[PDB]
């Protein structure tokens, strides 16, 4: 708090820079594609469509300032704070409401439309195979949708027949290590849903969704989550420019060793 107060400022600078970048006309998705997808039932009609997005990672040991960084970001920047779990949202509300004002925080699941009937959906039902390597992000999002297809299709069906994603484009996802990697794409896709369905003023402004994934990738191990799928995958490492958009809060992990080796990621003490 004595030095994090000053070390956290570049984090806000970079998040603001990300939240401001606009997209070209050829990059912003159009609702006609999504209606065409809804009109079908099988993934046979999903082309190499790209969903632009940005991500801001904040890692570190157990609570070494990540929660306080989320607090400062909420108190300064316009972010829609979410949670991986119900307990995560309750913890974030406990941290924020004890200092300043934040509206009741929902889970990112509750944000993007995850409901009860979504729990029984058959996850991993349809088959996919990677086309080339390094896999194009248009194929990565394709695969993530295919793995999660029942929930995505039911979301689209409900959407055709006030969402908080109209409020802003920076979405704070605490405990992002607890989220499945595929959900990542869904969230971005879900974001566009709202910004495509309601014809949101950000859509007319060609704004891009920005994610602030705050969590520890070490606490979750496969028996590969969002933090790990972003740190490891070369395609996402290149597209997201993760070398210049990464924070580590510190009081074997070869991954975090390489992170500290990289000069361009901020570390806050």
């Amino acid at each position: 708090n004595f030095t994090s107060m000053h070390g956290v400022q570049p984090i806000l600078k970079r998040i603001r820079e990300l939240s401001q970048q606009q997209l070209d006309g050829a990059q912003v998705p159009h609702l006609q594609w999504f209606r065409d997808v809804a009109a079908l039932e099988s993934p046979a009609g999903l082309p190499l469509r790209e969903f632009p997005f940005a991500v801001y990672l904040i890692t570190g040991n157990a609570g070494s300032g990540k929660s306080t960084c989320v607090q400062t970001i909420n108190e300064v920047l316009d972010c829609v704070v979410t949670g991986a779990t119900r307990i995560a949202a309750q913890n974030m509300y406990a941290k924020l409401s004890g200092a300043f004002l934040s509206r009741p925080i929902n889970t990112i699941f509750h944000e993007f439309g995850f409901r009860g009937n979504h729990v029984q959906a058959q996850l991993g039902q349809y088959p996919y195979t990677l086309t080339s390597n390094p896999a194009s992000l248009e194929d990565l999002q394709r695969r993530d949708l295919t793995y999660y297809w029942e929930v995505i299709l039911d979301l689209t069906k409900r959407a055709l027949a006030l969402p908080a994603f109209t409020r802003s484009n920076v979405i704070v996802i605490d405990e992002a290590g607890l989220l499945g990697r595929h959900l990542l794409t869904a969230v971005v896709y879900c974001w566009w849903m709202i910004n495509a369905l309601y014809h949101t003023p950000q859509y007319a402004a060609r704004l891009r969704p920005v994610l602030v994934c705050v969590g520890s990738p070490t606490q979750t191990a496969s028996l590969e989550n969002v933090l790990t799928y972003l740190i490891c995958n070369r395609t996402l490492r290149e597209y997201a420019r993760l070398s210049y958009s990464w924070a580590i809060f510190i009081n074997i992990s070869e991954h975090i060793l390489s992170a500290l080796r990289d000069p361009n990621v901020v570390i806050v003490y």
Partner: protein
């Protein structure tokens, strides 16, 4: 009159009908700046982020000495316990921090416009101006308004000089941490040492360089006792001097090229590359001399493909010296100086 801004409040159920179409106002270059700001004085919360948004626009001076109501968004649910808890129980905090964070930070800009409320409170805590005794717990907006409007901190030199003190405090702290973090980024970027030793080096640097005694000394040196910047009582903060001179001696001597060669180099018995930021305005000769000293020390240690090994050891030994760094490293983007009977071992 002069252009001023007010923060609306009301004891009972702040809503549009109370807004109608009474108010409870409780918050109403350098030399010239505080002179005019003193000359001004005598002796709804909502985001458009913008911490406060105006509701309307419109005898008035007396409302700032008695807190009398003047009879004809997200801050519609403000509470007195809210303000007392969130802006500290301290009167100086409750007045100055509230006034700066809600109103002055946005209208005046600067670095402090981006610091959160707790940072502002931490700055105001070490704003130790003299405490004039107050002749007279708060239960409602009337009580807090009478407490704030009659406060010594809401009038005159203190209110005039708080924002400038803010800016100066951020300036000092950021400059100190910026110099230290520039050195940390230097030794971070190219140091090819083992994993555990790199991690312990980073930990020891960021911890012992910013131990509580040095932070206390820095804060005490940044303590003010007069709101006047001309009569400011701030002292030269020795934080950077201590962190650089006093402790990198120990780190550089202990975590030196001799130990590195003795442990991580197993002998079985040189072109300089510069990344330019800007041209350097004696410095070049000094840098080459210190390069020569480092290379000579490495040669002495090594002599009681092999070319890659000797070049790597020379590069490490040259990095570990401080004089070469202070000579040239402030001007170079990256520090890969050298492009890469058998010197072997893990790397």
């Amino acid at each position: 009159p002069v252009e001023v801004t007010a923060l609306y409040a009301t004891d009972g159920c702040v809503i549009t009908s109370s807004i109608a179409l009474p108010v409870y106002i409780f918050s109403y270059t350098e030399q010239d700046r505080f002179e005019e700001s003193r000359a001004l004085y005598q002796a709804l919360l909502g985001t458009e982020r913008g911490r406060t948004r105006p509701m309307f626009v419109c005898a008035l001076q007396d409302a700032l000495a008695h807190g009398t109501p003047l009879q004809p968004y997200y801050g519609s649910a403000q509470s007195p316990f809210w303000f007392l808890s969130k802006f500290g129980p301290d009167e100086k905090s409750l007045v100055l921090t509230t006034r700066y964070y809600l109103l002055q930070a946005q209208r005046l800009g600067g670095a402090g416009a981006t610091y959160d409320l707790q940072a502002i409170k931490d700055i105001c805590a070490t704003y130790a101006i003299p405490h004039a005794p107050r002749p007279d717990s708060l239960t409602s907006f009337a009580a807090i308004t009478r407490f704030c409007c009659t406060s010594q901190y809401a009038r005159g030199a203190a209110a005039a000089g708080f924002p400038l003190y803010v800016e100066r405090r951020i300036a000092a702290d950021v400059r100190e941490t910026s110099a230290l973090e520039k050195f940390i980024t230097h030794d971070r970027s190219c140091l090819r040492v083992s994993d555990r030793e790199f991690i312990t080096y980073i930990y020891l640097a960021h911890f012992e360089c910013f131990s509580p005694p040095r932070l206390a000394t820095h804060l005490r040196a940044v303590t003010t006792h007069d709101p006047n910047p001309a009569a400011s009582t701030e002292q030269p903060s020795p934080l950077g001097r201590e962190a650089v001179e006093q402790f990198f001696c120990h780190v550089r001597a202990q975590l030196n090229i001799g130990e590195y060669v003795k442990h991580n180099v197993t002998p079985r018995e040189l072109d300089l590359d510069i990344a330019l930021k800007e041209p350097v305005p004696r410095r070049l000769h000094e840098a080459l001399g210190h390069f020569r000293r480092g290379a000579l020390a490495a040669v002495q240690l090594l002599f009681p493909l092999t070319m890659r090994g000797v070049a790597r050891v020379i590069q490490q030994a040259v990095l570990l010296d401080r004089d070469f760094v202070e000579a040239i490293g402030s001007y170079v983007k990256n520090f890969l100086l050298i492009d890469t009977h058998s010197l072997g071992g893990d790397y």
